[PDB]
């Protein structure tokens, strides 16, 4: 509970700017941590949607994301970070 009661719009307008800064930093840490997790484990999922459904892997057109020189793709890393900012911000807006 707040030590000081305040009109809902002021209480939210003050927290929203702190939240969007937090979501941007926390998404960047979650993407960085997931990039390390995928470099050690990505082959295994990426080895459960190709075995009883039927799918091929394009070893000619796309560099596999198990590789450091696929996983450092700046366009992927931007859109995945932005997705994490949308996710964390909408979920923390519900919580706030």
């Amino acid at each position: 509970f707040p030590i000081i009661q305040q009109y809902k719009f002021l209480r939210f307008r003050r927290s929203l700017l702190l939240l969007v800064k937090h979501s941007c930093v926390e998404s960047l840490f979650l993407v960085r941590n997931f990039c390390i997790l995928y470099y050690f484990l990505g082959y295994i999922p990426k080895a459960w949607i190709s075995t009883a459904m039927n799918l091929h892997i394009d070893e000619q057109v796309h560099r596999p994301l198990d590789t450091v020189s696929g996983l450092l793709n700046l366009s992927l890393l931007y859109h995945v970070w932005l997705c994490g900012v949308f996710l964390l911000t909408t979920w923390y807006v519900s919580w706030i």
């Binding site: 484990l41 999922p45 009883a52 039927n54």
Partner: protein
């Protein structure tokens, strides 16, 4: 067929060996790998004379380790004629190409479903008993 390709979309192929009838009756077939088989589907001795062989993989896991290249040799001891066809086996393994993580949830959710319901009913019985114990002590 001058070469054969076997894969997720083409798990077998059908090749015709042509010749004279006597050479086709006395036609051996020999694979360079026990993971690849061929069986005679039909014989025609009427012109043009042939035998159709359906060629396929006995074990898809032999194709999981990499592109298995082999030969399929058809040979007739009556004329000492032989023809050897390359066979490439390329199975990019079929609801994704294992390891430890991914698969290990949704299979276990079906294997363990009786233990999941038993533990759910044991937790519902345990919480019901704790609520009855509260309403007899508090």
């Amino acid at each position: 067929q001058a070469e054969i390709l076997l894969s997720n979309h083409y798990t077998s192929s059908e090749i015709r060996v042509f010749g004279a009838p006597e050479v086709l009756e006395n036609l051996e077939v020999k694979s360079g790998s026990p993971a690849v088989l061929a069986f005679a589907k039909e014989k025609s001795f009427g012109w043009p004379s042939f035998i159709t062989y359906t060629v396929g993989v006995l074990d898809p896991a032999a194709g999981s380790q990499g592109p298995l290249s082999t030969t399929l040799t058809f040979s007739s001891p009556v004329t000492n004629q032989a023809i050897a066809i390359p066979v490439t086996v390329a199975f990019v393994v079929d609801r994704r190409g294992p390891g430890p993580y991914g698969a290990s949830l949704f299979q276990h959710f079906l294997d363990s479903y009786q233990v999941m319901f038993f533990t759910l009913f044991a937790l519902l019985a345990g919480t019901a008993v704790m609520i009855i114990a509260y309403h007899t002590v508090c």
